[PDB]
Amino acid sequence: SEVDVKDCANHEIKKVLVPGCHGSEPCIIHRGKPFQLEAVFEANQNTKTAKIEIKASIDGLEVDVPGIDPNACHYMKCPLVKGQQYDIKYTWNVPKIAPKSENVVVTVKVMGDDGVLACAIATHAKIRD
Amino acid sequence: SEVDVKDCANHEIKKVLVPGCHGSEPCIIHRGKPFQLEAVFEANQNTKTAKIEIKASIDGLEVDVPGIDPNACHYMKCPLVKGQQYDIKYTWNVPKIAPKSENVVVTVKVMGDDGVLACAIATHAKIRD
């Protein structure tokens, strides 16, 4: 369930797992259903904070992503230790009303005390149902 | 299966389901794990709105509940029509850092355009792990 994502920092993200998706094949996101993911990254800094920013665009238009807790330290053992690897598991609820699209770009950026912790761009999600 | 809840509105909620939980038996919420829930209710009003408020109390102290999308219309087809029954499914991510407790009270109120859509109090959840 390892999926291909584009790193946009310095390869801190080691592996992104989405059950039911793989590699660079179209990863189908079904409206109204849970979407599970798991990510393993290495901390590039000692940091008390880990804050998530998500940007999604559907056919080139930016859309709000509801239901995300911005504080990643709620789901991990902060503070983070430089050189250690952390695992985060999260289930996102796909809105029943999300616009269908075959051209989806998701950018997630994680900020710590001393700058970006992790950055990934995912281009293979498709929203259907 | 079906779990037991106290209604605090006018019996609009028909059934609450949590997998692995039964009636009034201790329903165990695990730290750092997904908590799945399903509910069917009957709309008592025509409404384009349906906004959720949660309050949680742990051993008699209120604690903030993160990771909740207050717009319930994201997970249903609003507007709602009076007299129709709706089903909502939602997976909540239990914070890794949630205080452990055997005395947990959860109160969920749903508010529509012209008044309370639904209200339930749940007293059998325990936070462990």
Q: Residue A112: in which H helix or E strand, if any?
A: strand A104-112
**In the numeric block, which tokens belong to residue A69?**
């807790």
Residues in chain A: 129
Question: CA triplet B102, B124, B126: central angle to 5 degrees?
Answer: 35
For the record, the structure tokens of B55 come out as 């309050």
Subunit contact B96:A90, Cβ cutoff 8 A: no
What is the biggest distance separating any 2 CA atoms in chain A, rounded to whole angstroms? 42
In CATH, what number is assigned to the domain containing residue B114?
2.60.40.770
Distance, in Å, from the CA atom of A35 to the CA atom of A28, rounded to the nearest integer, reads 10
Chain centre distance of CA A65: 11
Residue A113 CA to residue A47 CA, distance in Å, equals 5
User: How many whole angstroms separate alpha carbon A18 and alpha carbon A38?
Assistant: 7
Q: b/e map of B82-100 (b: 16 or more CB within 10 Å)?
A: eeeebebbbbbbbbbebee
Structure tokens at B31: 């730290």
* CB distance A73 to B98 below 8 Å: no
Residue A56 β-bridge partners = A63, A106
- In sequence order, what DSSP letters do the residues of B75-123 get, joined into one string? GS-SSBPTT-EEEEEEEEE--TTPPPBS-EEEEEEEEETTEEEEEEEE-
What count of CB pairs under 8 Å joins A to B? Answer: 48
| Separation CA B105–CA B125 (nearest Å) | 8
How many angstroms away from the CA of A71 is the closest CA of chain B?
9
Is-contact B69 B118, C-beta < 8 A? no
From the list A71, A93, A97, the residue facing B90 with the nearest CB is A93
Residues of A in contact with B69 (CB under 8 A): 66-67, 93
The tally of domains found in chain A comes to: 1
Interchain pair B97, A73: CB under 8 A: yes
Report the amino acid identity of residue B120: A
Inter-residue contact B108 to B52 (CB < 8 Å): yes
Helix ranges restricted to H, chain A: none
Cβ partners under 8 Å of residue A62, min gap 6: A55, A56
Burial (Cβ within 10 Å: 0-12, 13-18, ≥19) of residue B115: exposed
Question: For residue A85, what are the contacts with CB-CB under 8 A and spacing of at least 6?
Answer: A14, A40, A41, A42, A43
Indicate the SS3 state at residue B22: coil
Nearest to A46 by CA among A11, A83, A74, A85: A83
Taking a C-beta distance cutoff of 8 angstroms, is the pair A127, A33 a contact? no
Query: Which residues on chain B are in Cβ contact (under 8 Å) with A67?
Result: 67-69, 74
Closest CA to A15 of A32, A30, A1: A1
Distance (Å, whole) CA B98 – CA B47 = 34
For the four alpha carbons of A56, A104, A100 and A96, in that order, the dihedral sign comes to: negative
Query: What is the experimental resolution, given in Å to one decimal place?
Result: 2.2
Nearest CA in chain A to B32: A75
Question: Gaps after which residues in chain A, C–N over 2.5 Å?
Answer: none
Distance from CA of B44 to the nearest CA of A (A): 21
Cβ pair A31, A95 in contact under 8 A: yes
Write phi, then psi, for A56 (nearest 5 degrees).
-120, 140
Tokens of A71: 């504080």
Backbone φ and ψ for B107, nearest 5 degrees, come out as: -125, 125
Give the distance between the most distant pair of CA atoms in chain B: 42
Residue B20, sorted as left (phi over 0), alpha (psi -120 to 50) or beta, turns out to be left
- CA–CA gap between residue B65 and residue A19 (Å, rounded): 27
Q: What is the 3-state secondary structure (H, E, C) of A78-111?
A: CCECCCCEEEEEEEEECCCCCCCECCEEEEEEEE
Copy the structure tokens of residue B32: 């750092």
Q: ω before B66 within 30° of 0 (cis)? A: no
CB–CB contact B96 A89 (8 Å): no
User: A72 in helix, strand or coil?
Assistant: helix
**Buried/exposed A39-50: b ≥16 CB within 10 Å, e otherwise:** bebbbbeebebb
Taking the C-alpha atoms of residue B106 and residue B92, their distance in angstroms, rounded to an integer, is 14
Q: Which domain holds residue B113?
A: 1-129
The closest of A38, A45, A10 to A119, measured between CA atoms, is A10
Q: Which residues of A touch B (CB under 8 A)?
A: 32, 34, 36, 66-67, 69, 71, 73-77, 89-91, 93, 95-97
